[PDB]
């Protein structure tokens, strides 16, 4: 996460981290409930066998409320494809149920129409992760959040170099040096409405980090809602 702030105690409770076997956090995720996790459908490639950590805000100083969970099943999206990064979205079912305590709670899943209407028309949104803090840099130790404004879909499509489908949206800044970087994939994008957050995006891809004239591409979560349902009903 280039720029942004630092997630304070129980401030980003829905964050999640997919750690490889060497115990390294490679991607992100979002807690939907005690058994299901929401991630990018393209993070199920950066490893062979991975786990999901929750409750960690600092990767190095064993706080206390951490907890590792094992993946029972992966639900990658049918239509997904690396060639165009369309349908970047998958859901993980954990074996042991996530126990909500401090720094561990789930994010709400909104209704589609109400969401696109009031959540995506909101001014900003929040993205968070343990991702790189400067394109060429080392990953991050602390967990962090960046309030990234929604971008006009046109500009988005103009500023891009790749077809910005209807299953994705832009968010971020044109010049500022603040924009999710490597390692934030699958991470959570939530919108805030009346002190209660709702999942709205999944860190997907981007041309570099915080680049001039380029934005941050997220997966339109509203465009997969129904999918997410029968995905938690298992399928």
């Amino acid at each position: 996460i280039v720029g942004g702030q630092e997630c304070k105690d129980g401030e980003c409770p829905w964050q999640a981290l997919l750690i490889n076997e060497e115990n390294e956090g490679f991607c992100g995720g979002t807690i939907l409930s005690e058994f299901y996790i929401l991630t990018a459908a393209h993070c199920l490639y950066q490893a062979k066998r991975f786990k999901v950590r929750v409750g960690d805000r600092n990767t190095e100083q064993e706080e206390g409320g951490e907890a590792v969970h094992e993946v029972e099943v992966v639900i990658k999206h049918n239509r997904f494809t690396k060639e165009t990064y369309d349908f970047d979205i998958a859901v993980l079912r954990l074996k042991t149920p996530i126990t909500f305590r401090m720094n561990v709670a789930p994010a709400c899943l909104p209704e589609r129409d109400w969401a696109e209407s009031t959540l995506m028309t909101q001014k900003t949104g929040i993205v968070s992760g343990f991702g790189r803090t400067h394109e060429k840099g080392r990953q991050s130790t602390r967990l962090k959040m960046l309030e990234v404004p929604y971008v006009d879909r046109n500009s988005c499509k103009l500023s891009s170099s790749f077809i910005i489908t209807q299953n994705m949206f832009c968010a971020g800044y044109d010049t500022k040096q603040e924009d999710a970087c490597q390692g934030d994939s699958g991470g959570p994008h939530v919108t805030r409405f009346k002190d209660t957050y709702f999942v709205t995006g999944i860190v997907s891809w981007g041309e570099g980090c915080a680049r001039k004239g380029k934005y941050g591409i997220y997966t339109k979560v509203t465009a997969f809602l129904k999918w997410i349902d029968r995905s938690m009903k298992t399928r």
């Binding site: 105690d9 720094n103 789930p106 709400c108 009031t118 409405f193 957050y197």
Partner: protein, 51 residues
Amino acid sequence: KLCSLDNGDCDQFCHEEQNSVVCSCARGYTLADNGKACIPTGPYPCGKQTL
């Protein structure tokens, strides 16, 4: 009706069902007696920062 005004003055989901406004919440919540506010039912409701 008019979830256009101020989200129907709801707490969360707002619906211009038929002629009037109809509020609703996410899972884990329940709509208050006033049909507008959303109240938790468990100690760890989605969307709330654990403070």
